[PDB]
Structure formats: structure tokens, C-alpha cells
Design a protein around this nucleic acid. Structure first.
Ligand code: NA
Ligand code: NA
Lengths: 272, 272
DNA sequence: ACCGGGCCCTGCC
DNA sequence: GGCAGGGCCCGGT
């Protein structure tokens, strides 16, 4: 894909995603927000919060940020890769229709990449160096080893993509998933010849047939969509109203007369 | 364990932990803080930030909150359960000293609980409804199945503890780990006779031999520890200085004269 | 309400 | 610097 193809189509995807994240606020969707009732007194003082409204504000901001990271990884995987780069996403419909992708060892594979020279690459994509931990890495090894040994014909190789950061900053989990296990034993199997990891600039390059500048074209598409969306003023009030909607869930039952929180009442509500 | 034992010993653990989270700030420990360089323009406008320093303040606040959740989970598991409730932590030394615990299927078991009536229960502990996703649930299933099949004599049963929330609020992942798989096939094995999940008030009560008020004693220890640490004033400056520290890692490469940032320089730095 | 995924660190070696 | 773990949602349906 060339510079115009990438910028314009990323813009389109990102434009959509901005609306989706706005709708979180306009529709007052707070049902997915967890609160750890043991940590509340700690957070209140560590971050120098002055009242219950300020507590709800800090919690909401954290929830929104978590949501942004999650939605963004979904955006890259489910919209940008297929629509901008022509990757075939292994969604429900694709998997049911294309043998042998229905088997659960493909739950860990995001896309099939069909190269112009006839090569087929399978892709398992992650955002960054922290995205996986040990449990996930071992499970990735199990899945990949099954593909390799039981469905050798489906593709020429498996790539794990990491869309930001670099190779040197990756954790040992990216070794574990290849079967490289230098510390305590976890019973992963060496598959390093068939599974390769590409990160950051090098991932975007690998995706787009060696075009080194691809990552800048992606960032530019996002920039343009943000600018056209023009949300920097209107969101202040939408965020404040999200905050008021959440506090109303608690502020006529956890508060004392002096405005302090009854942390044991918040505990009660959450833990049963 | 009785009311005063739990309150006071939780207080000692939490006081230790407070000092750990303080030393994050005083030692300017920021090398674990990732930044997604594609999201920066979105965050900047969505949350109505005015310059690079406000972007760094926002990201640090999020990283601190992530670090709090992470730390607190490790606190419950590694310090509180063993020091307060007498649970045996499967750390490296314990696992080496007690067959068959060195085997990797026990990688997912946090503790052995020895009941005074002779019962022996294994515990895999999690914070909340969101802690695990599909990949982790399926791996947990595999580890627990192997324990049940290959090591039936090591315990009476396995418990998954969820330390906040309630059973109604749990996701389907807590069913999947038991081998209950009603949707797309993931090849998990039904082990629900030997694996049970307890959440919130019920987890704490299960842990402490049926004492229903245990969750409240845990919270009271934490509150005392926070009250006693007196951190609300001094942290304001500590967090400001953490921000100054982080911003200097990028300022020379990314800053415009007006204190805004060059997103493409930020991307270049991060992605190779 | 389901559900198949998506995502970011600490504390001690 | 390694490493065995620790943590929290979206979007389609
Ligand atoms: Na993925
Ligand atoms: Na655990």
C-alpha cells in the first residue's frame, strides 16, 4: 500500500473510532467499570483527592484510559489491518468458511496475510511489550506448535506482531512464546524457526512489503481524523456529565454528613 | 483468625506496601512506563490537554494507577494471605521443598490452604471479574485438569478466589476455566466437580473458615495503615517531580517552543 | 447478558 | 537486566 492509500483509509477507520469513544460518554455507559473497594482509602490519599467527586473523577479517568487502550488494539486488528492493508481477519464468518480455521488452535491467530509472491503468513498481533504475561505466552506456544505440527499446509510461517516499541524493549514473554525458556521450567516447545517477532517500525514495514515509512502514514491518518473530529471543547462537559452519572450511583449512600466516605458501605455494595 | 489479628496484621502488610509505592516516586522509577505513540494525538484532544507536560501528567497518572492495581494484587497474594491467614505461598523455595509442586502445572496455583479438620485446598487467586481473558481461562483449565488427573493426592479440591466483586458480576471466563464452554469451541475439559469459584464477601469468608465479617477487617487494617502513613500532603510535590523527570526523557527530541510536542519525533523514538 | 477476544506492571533475583 | 508472575475493558451481537 502506498502513502495515500494508507493515510486516507486509516483516517476513515480512526474517524469511526473517535465516534465510538464519544458514544461511551454520550450514552453514559458505566456498567463495565470496576472499583476495588479495598484500594479506595489508599488512592484517596496517595493522589491528594479532596472530596468524593474528585475520587469518582480519578476513577473515571483511569477507566477511560483503559478503554482507550483496549479499543485502540481492537481498531488496529479488526478495522485497519483488513481495510487498509488487505489482511484477512479470522472472524467468526471467515473461520466457519475456510478450512481448517475452525479448530481452536486458531483462536490465537488474528489474520492471514497473502503475499503477491504466493507466500502465506499467519499473524498474531499485540500492542506492546507488556500486553502478554507468562500464562498467555505458554498458551500462545501451545497453539502455534499445534498449527505447525498438525496443519503444516495452512501457511509458510507465523509472525507475532508488536505494533509499538522495539525489539530490544520486549520482555522475555516474547521468547517464551517461541519455546525459548531459560529460567524456571514451563514446558513450552522450541518452534523458533517457524515463529518470528517483529516490533514497532519493523512490524509496520513487514506488514506493508518493506515500506519503512508506513508507521508515519498510520500516525498521519489518525492525526487528520482527530483534527476533523474537533472534540477538544465539547468533551469537557461530556466528561463532567459522565462523572456526575457515576457519582449518583454512590453519593446518596456511601457519604457521611461531613462529606467523608463510608468505605465499608462502598465495600458492602461491591462485594455481595 | 479473629478480628484483631486480621486488622492488625493486614495493617502491617499495607504499611509496608505504602512505603513501596512511595519509593516509586522518590526513586523516580519510570523505566517500566510504556507510551503508545499512535494514541497520543487522540488522548491530547479527547481529554483536552494543552501541552506536552499535561500529556505526560495524564500518562503518569494512568501508569501509577496500573502500578497500584498490580502491586495490590501481589500484596494480597504474597504478604497478606501467608502473614495474616497462614496460607502457604507456592514460591520457589516452597515448591522445591514439597513434591510435586515443582512441576509446571502448579505455576497457576498461588497457595496451599491447610484446614484444621485435615482438608487441603489449593487456591488460584485473582482480583476481580476482569482479571482474566479467554487465553488465560483456557490455560488455567489445562493446568487444573493436569493437577486433577496426574496429582489427585495433593489436595481435596481447587478454588479460584476473586477478592472483590460478587459471583453475579463475574464474566464467562470464570465458567470456561471449569470447562463450561457454551459458545465457540475452545477444547476445555469439564472439571467443575473439583474446581469452584468464590468472590467478594464469600471468598474472604471461605478463606477465614466462615467468618462473614473478614472482608471488613481487611479493609480496616488498610484504612489504619493509610491514616498512619500521612502521605496526602507530601505526595503532591512527589508526583510533580515524577512528571518533570519523565518529561526530560523526551523534551529535547520532541518539544516545540510553545511546549507542544512533535508526535512524529515521539513515534520515531519509541518505535525503533 | 453473552462472549471472543482486547489491553498495561512489580518486587524480588 | 532477567523473570514469574501481577493487573483492567470493547464492540458485535
Ligand atoms: Na491479537
Ligand atoms: Na493469582
Amino acid at each position: 500500500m502506498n502513502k495515500q492509500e494508507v493515510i486516507l483509509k486509516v483516517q476513515e477507520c480512526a474517524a469511526w473510532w473517535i465516534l465510538e469513544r464519544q458514544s461511551k460518554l454520550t450514552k453514559l455507559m458505566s456498567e463495565t467499570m470496576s472499583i476495588n473497594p479495598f484500594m479506595t482509602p489508599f488512592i484517596f490519599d496517595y493522589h491528594s483527592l479532596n472530596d468524593f467527586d474528585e475520587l469518582v473523577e480519578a476513577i473515571i479517568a483511569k477507566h477511560l484510559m483503559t478503554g482507550h487502550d483496549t479499543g485502540f488494539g481492537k481498531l488496529i486488528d479488526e478495522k485497519i489491518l483488513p481495510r487498509v492493508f488487505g489482511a484477512y481477519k479470522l472472524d467468526k464468518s471467515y473461520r466457519a468458511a475456510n478450512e481448517p480455521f475452525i479448530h481452536p488452535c486458531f483462536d490465537e491467530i488474528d489474520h492471514v496475510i497473502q503475499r503477491d509472491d504466493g507466500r502465506i503468513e499467519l499473524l498474531s498481533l499485540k500492542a506492546g511489550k507488556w500486553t502478554i504475561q507468562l500464562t498467555m505466552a505458554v498458551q500462545l506456544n501451545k497453539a502455534f506448535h499445534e498449527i505447525i505440527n498438525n496443519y503444516p499446509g495452512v501457511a509458510d510461517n507465523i509472525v507475532v506482531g508488536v505494533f509499538y516499541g522495539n525489539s530490544h524493549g520486549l520482555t522475555d514473554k516474547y521468547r517464551i512464546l517461541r519455546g525459548i525458556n531459560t529460567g524456571a521450567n514451563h514446558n513450552v516447545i522450541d518452534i523458533r524457526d517457524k515463529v518470528h517477532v517483529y516490533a514497532g517500525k519493523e512490524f509496520w514495514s513487514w506488514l506493508n512489503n518493506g515500506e519503512a515509512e508506513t508507521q508515519h502514514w498510520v500516525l498521519e491518518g489518525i492525526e487528520r481524523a482527530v483534527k476533523e473530529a474537533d472534540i477538544k471543547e465539547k468533551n469537557k462537559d461530556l466528561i463532567e456529565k459522565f462523572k456526575e452519572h457515576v457519582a449518583k450511583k454512590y453519593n446518596e449512600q456511601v457519604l457521611n454528613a461531613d462529606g467523608t466516605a463510608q468505605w465499608h458501605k462502598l465495600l458492602e455494595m461491591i462485594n455481595e
